[PDB]
Assembly symmetry: D2
Homo-oligomer: 387 residues x 4
């Protein structure tokens, strides 16, 4: 049951189903997949589109001619399937030249090169119809304290993003940027480690309106944070431009499990939030089919990502629509949380004896919040065991 269609806006990076299985302790377990084949297979599964890093599509070092050809072949597969490309990004982490970062490398020549490599890909992304350009600064950071002066590094990071905003403005492109935070791995500590740090940083750029965040489930969970709470803050700020979905089992290396695996209750609350807030961007999967799998397992893993999202969507919708749940929400005062604390204004509050002098603290303290009953209704709904 639960079959996805392109209207569900499910997207996948070419590097997800294309991951060959090389890990820090082992060789590849699968042969390389041609991007054309991945587009075809994903389309068959009901995906809406694909995403790419420049180097996933055009082998690093390719001549302008080989480049052409890679693009032409890719475009033909998109035309043949109806698949879209809503987002693109730059690989500023694989090649040895980026060992100390791209935008924040200590070497100035590298920083310049990083910007040129990025701008080249922005042109390509626009050509392919992408509306979001993601930046994951996976090598921006350090393993030791004296290696990076963080204030200088943020000055460099701001400079790079401001230059990119100037470029898109000048070309008149309709494309926005999304910064993807990650707390660590591959660097000991990565700069702008969480959604909060990325949101704060954006506020210091020259044209903040061009930038948002691209949070990833597993990344925030690597810091032990509540992913749905972080997404709520991004939505509250009007900055959720894109989202990366996957699963992670706690604080450890980035597992990139299929969506729904990892913390299942957090997946439920995330879907509840995306659907309630009416998020309309792509539902992108940045995951890796385990290296234990063959190609059949790759497609099964990708299909499971979409299936899990649809099952959760159904259960969250049934939860919110259940009259008994609506009643429990009022019992727990969720309605009162939505009302202004003092629309009456400061003076009125200062003059209100019921707010202090005559406030019965003990009576208020004795009121139960009834959160456990509400949470068991949510559990019953998730498990399909009532409501």
């Amino acid at each position: 049951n639960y079959q996805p269609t392109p209207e569900d806006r499910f997207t996948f990076g070419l590097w997800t189903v294309g991951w060959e299985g090389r890990d820090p302790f082992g060789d590849a377990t699968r042969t390389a997949l041609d991007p054309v084949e991945s587009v075809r297979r994903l389309a068959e599964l009901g995906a809406h589109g694909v995403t790419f890093h420049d180097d996933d599509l055009i082998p690093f070092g390719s001549s302008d001619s080989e480049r052409y050809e890679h693009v032409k072949r890719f475009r033909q597969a998109l035309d043949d399937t109806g698949m879209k490309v809503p987002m693109a990004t730059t690989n500023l982490f694989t090649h040895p030249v980026f060992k100390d970062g791209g935008f924040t490398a200590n070497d100035r020549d590298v920083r310049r090169y990083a910007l040129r490599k990025t701008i080249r890909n922005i042109d390509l992304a626009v050509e392919l119809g992408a509306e979001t350009y993601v930046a994951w600064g996976g090598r921006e950071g350090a393993e030791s304290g004296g290696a990076k002066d963080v204030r200088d590094a943020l000055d460099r990071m701001k400079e790079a993003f401001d230059l990119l905003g100037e470029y898109v403005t000048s070309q008149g492109y309709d494309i926005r940027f999304a910064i993807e935070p990650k707390p660590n791995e591959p660097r000991g500590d990565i700069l702008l480690p969480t959604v909060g740090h990325a949101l704060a940083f954006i506020e210091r750029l020259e044209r903040p309106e061009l930038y948002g965040v691209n949070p990833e489930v597993g990344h925030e969970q690597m810091a032990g944070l509540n992913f749905p709470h972080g997404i709520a803050q991004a939505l509250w700020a009007g900055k959720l431009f894109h989202i990366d979905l996957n699963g992670q089992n706690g604080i450890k290396y980035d597992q990139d499990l299929r969506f729904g695996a990892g913390d299942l209750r957090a997946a439920f609350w995330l879907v509840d939030l995306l659907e309630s807030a009416g998020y309309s961007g792509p539902r992108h999967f940045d995951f890796k089919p385990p290296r234990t799998e063959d190609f059949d397992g790759v497609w099964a893993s990708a299909a499971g990502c979409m299936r899990n999202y649809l099952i959760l969507k159904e259960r969250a919708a049934a939860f919110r629509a259940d009259p008994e749940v609506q009643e429990a929400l009022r019992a727990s005062r969720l309605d009162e949380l939505a009302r202004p604390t003092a629309a009456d204004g400061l003076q009125a509050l200062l003059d209100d004896r019921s707010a202090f002098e005559e406030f019965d603290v003990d009576a208020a303290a004795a009121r139960g919040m009834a959160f456990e009953r509400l949470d068991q209704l949510a559990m019953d709904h998730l498990l399909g065991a009532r409501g």
Copy 2:
């Protein structure tokens, strides 16, 4: 050796040395300390001042008269010792009425009460000469997903802070606010969990200039984050209004060990940064002498906080002043990180063939960063084993 003086600006909360030792699994191991006695003992140790929550100074429920008296006695001890009160805060977490929060409690009546209790203490803080008013929303959060709609909660949090800014503006007080983030404990997840989340939030307030952050070593470490990196971002934003120092051994409950305990290398890099950036606010200790200790152990623990800061200050200064270290910093290109990537401008960068077309990636990739030698010089300096 390493003796502190009031000029070192070391401050302590009354609740630190005054902690009786009650933990989630045990009764108090020490009798209550009179605030007057704590002021006297701290002054003797060389501290510069003390801080307080309203309820530490005036027992919750006190009549206006008893209140007077508590204040008069406290003021006399400050006058007798020369101790200052640079910061004050509100207890919106102990009393049962705050079980679901203060500013973000689902019950509107509680939210109003929370604001009135806070405003009352702001007046007192100003009277005592405090320049910073801290807000730690330790009960703002949840243990389950449906109990708190985070967007509504942030609307409530913004409303509360905006009202406080309106109050101080209207009274013409010279006092600024500092938000103290914490990821969890006592709530399952706390709102504005890290310095990044707090910085981002401040940017949406009506008068952002009145608010900064009051980060705490152990709090960011409870999320596995790099404390010195977070402080660098706060300084970069011009928002480090105050700082709380302590020690924590990784991701676990908030230990509140004395400063220098926990992650010693992180303590070194933090002191290096505070001293290099010329931070001039109080060096405040929010720690708890372990419940294994008697009063002698309390004073020994407090003294150790200051001693460790002074030892680290000396070692960081010797590190930065060592010619061999200055040379290693240039070998690692820290000087180049401080130079603009493209002061020449966007067009110039686009036209620069040395930045892309003729950039020798392999030659750049082959350059070692020499970070290990630099980090061993930092280790030798910390340990007093050379440079």
Copy 3:
């Protein structure tokens, strides 16, 4: 639906539903519950029995007479309800005298007192029909390195347990001991921090057969470990004497959420294992209804513990019984994992050219494990969305 009965063997500690809500940052939110009332309420919910620490039942310091009376009243409630007492334990953590431990306190006089307090409660436990006596050494550990020589502490821990084994042997009691590991909280680091450390320790006692483990979901998760894997090792060793069920959201303070909350997929795999291995001891809940709740919320939370176990039991049973799942298990070679690697013996293996000289490594390497399809079948079963 999913209604528990005494035959389900669900048990609760008096301190679980009796928790008043005092946390490290706040006062109690609920009045004390009389043990008699808790027995009655639990019986009504369908529980099978209750457990207790000596101090939960008899207020610390009680005269022999008051003690009698507390016991008589308790016994009458058990008789009136049919509730049993399968396990009992000692409180060697609340009173200030245990600030540095019970069995491993540096002070010898305290260690002697700890043993006497424990032996007194063993007699009571036997009288009430308990078959398991649990030991949670929550204060055995340290906050700093020089405070505890761990080898001396383990010698003391071994001495205490050997003396307890000698006591029960000598009295001819039929009661076994279960050690409950916890990695930290309230001490900075607790001795025998995980199920593995406790299992290893037992092997050095004088009569290892009298001791097993009493693992707790949240405790192993506080170390980021796989709870079901740890329980499998305890079962493999024949040492799972009892089990404590609750929920925990990752590495942070011990949350003690109701069972099913926290890591739901881990709860599923744990039930699958307990039910498949035919574990027949009590299903004990060591949890705390959140301090946000009133008495109605306490009973709702306790009921949810049992409900979640029964729902998971049903889903795990449907998973194992599904023919499609049985087929997937064979596709993934779970049947081959159960077969001896070399029942043929060492020489035969050494002489087997198919095991090395003629083994086709590439062909074996190319075989997919089909684990993703199997895991999606498990997800579908948990969610009630097929199989």
Copy 4:
């Protein structure tokens, strides 16, 4: 200063200084090092010996002849330098055939192959004079619950180790086994995740005396555990056969930093313990020079490992030898922890009224442990700022 000599017993794996820098997100940053060159360079730095995985020395797939040659060349470098080979191990993790494990792979044919590959290397290890054979089952584990029945897997693990013990017994070799635990990475959860789990497992083998543990600093820290406490338990059991030293900054991916980096205070307490207990095996470094470094940085990193150990050794020795520290140890009752709790026996304890009936709990409770003063003396000693 602090110069190592072969008498310090410092050893390094060929794969440590030989790590090319490939990580999950990037290509190699350094060319391959010939083992002969690494032996020569390490000897120059003052190391005592090297260790190897079969595949580090003989390229996987090598003919018996090429194998000979690799060994002959290696032996000549050992002869030319005086370097020893105290430990050897098997690579049962890199090749795709081991994607689901070696000893616990679901496929029986793989398990047989894993044993044959291991036995072949045991013969070589003995030939080279190794006294310890390490087993790190990095691929033994799972990413999902149904993929591995843990009881069957432990039966397979026990079978493999018993067969290896039978082999060495039968050949009359003088070599012991050491199991190296790791909680996760590369598998989602690894079997025998901590030193405790490995110690417990050994007790179920047929000849437990042939097996011990080879704990690694960073591995236990990836579970948030106290490394020195775990080593104390291994020593207490008489099972510390070897030890792997490195640095790790908390719960995250395995960083493999040089020893002394990471948690410096834990490094201090570990050296204090190894030196006090008189551990006489190799001080082995299993670390990776960061990929930011060139060959000069590799040698600087390796040298720093040894330097840090020697500096810590000096500071721990000065701490233990300081009369003021000896006095503080008695003030904290470390002497009393070393005395039997009840050498008088059980009956005597039962009859001792001073142990219960007349024990003054309040007086005992009021005694401070004086641990903070002791810990500040340890800090002063580590920092070279007194005692």
